[PDB]
Amino acid sequence: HMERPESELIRQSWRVVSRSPLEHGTVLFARLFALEPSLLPLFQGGGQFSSPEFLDHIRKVMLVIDAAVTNVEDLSSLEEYLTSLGRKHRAVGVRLSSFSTVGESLLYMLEKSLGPDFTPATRTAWSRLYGAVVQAMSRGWDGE
Ligand code: HEM
């Protein structure tokens, strides 16, 4: 139940991001790995000593976010998918807490993409949308 003005804040900002999703995705992940560098070895080539490739995984992440934005007014049709996606991440050793770090990284990347256009309402909207995505994913840890 996000109302139209906030929905439109999200849709407009997402269009900006969507001009260059890999570029922006790399910003998100660079911040993520600064906060939680332990995540790196999950990716192909991310270890000092099969696994997803980094840029392909960014495309995937941006496609999930894209589906969330498409469904910003009501995420209900994505719930089963998201729960499944959470299960997948759990199974490979990604802690649920790391999704909070992703959220921080997402807000960072948006701030960088948008500057003053990243209004307080836009930030709050995105926090609520992403929070809802993570809520659905969390079913995967039995950890709602
Ligand atoms: C801490 C952050 C993350 C790490 C370390 C990470 C890691 C991974 C790993 C290791 C896989 C492979 C899973 C497998 O093959 O079974 C994967 C798959 C995937 N991840 Fe992530 N992930 C992260 C966040 C995200 C987020 C936030 C999204 C979406 C919003 C996402 C979307 C995907 C998708 C769509 C797949 C493909 C799943 C499939 O094969 O069906 N990831 N991720």
Author numbering: 0 to 48, 56 to 150
Study text:
The double conformation of the heme in 70:30 proportion, along with corresponding histidine double conformations, is present and His64(Nε)-Fe-His96(Nε) angles are unchanged with respect to WT. Besides some alternate conformations of the N- and C-termini, of the AB and EF loops, due to crystal packing changes, only the CD loop was significantly altered. Owing to the mutation of Tyr44 into a glycine, the propionate flips toward the proximal side of the heme, and the amino group of Lys67 is rotated by 180°. The absence of Tyr44, that is not pinning any more the loop to the heme, allows the displacement of Phe49 which might explain the D-helix destabilization. Quite surprisingly, the hydrophobic cluster involved in the support of the heme, and including the canonical Phe28(B10), Phe32(B14), Phe42(CD1) and Phe61(E4) is loosened in the Gly-loop mutant. As shown, in Fig. 4D, Phe42 and Phe61 are displaced with respect to the WT Ngb phenylalanine cluster: Phe42 is located about 0.6 Å further away from the heme (Cε(Phe42)-C3 methyl(heme) distance), whereas Phe61 is laterally shifted of approximately 2.4 Å (Cζ(Phe61 wt)-Cζ(Phe61 mutant) distance). The mobilization of the CD-loop-D-helix unit could facilitate the His64 dissociation from the heme iron, unlocking its swing-out displacement, thus leading to the increased CO binding velocities observed by rapid mixing.
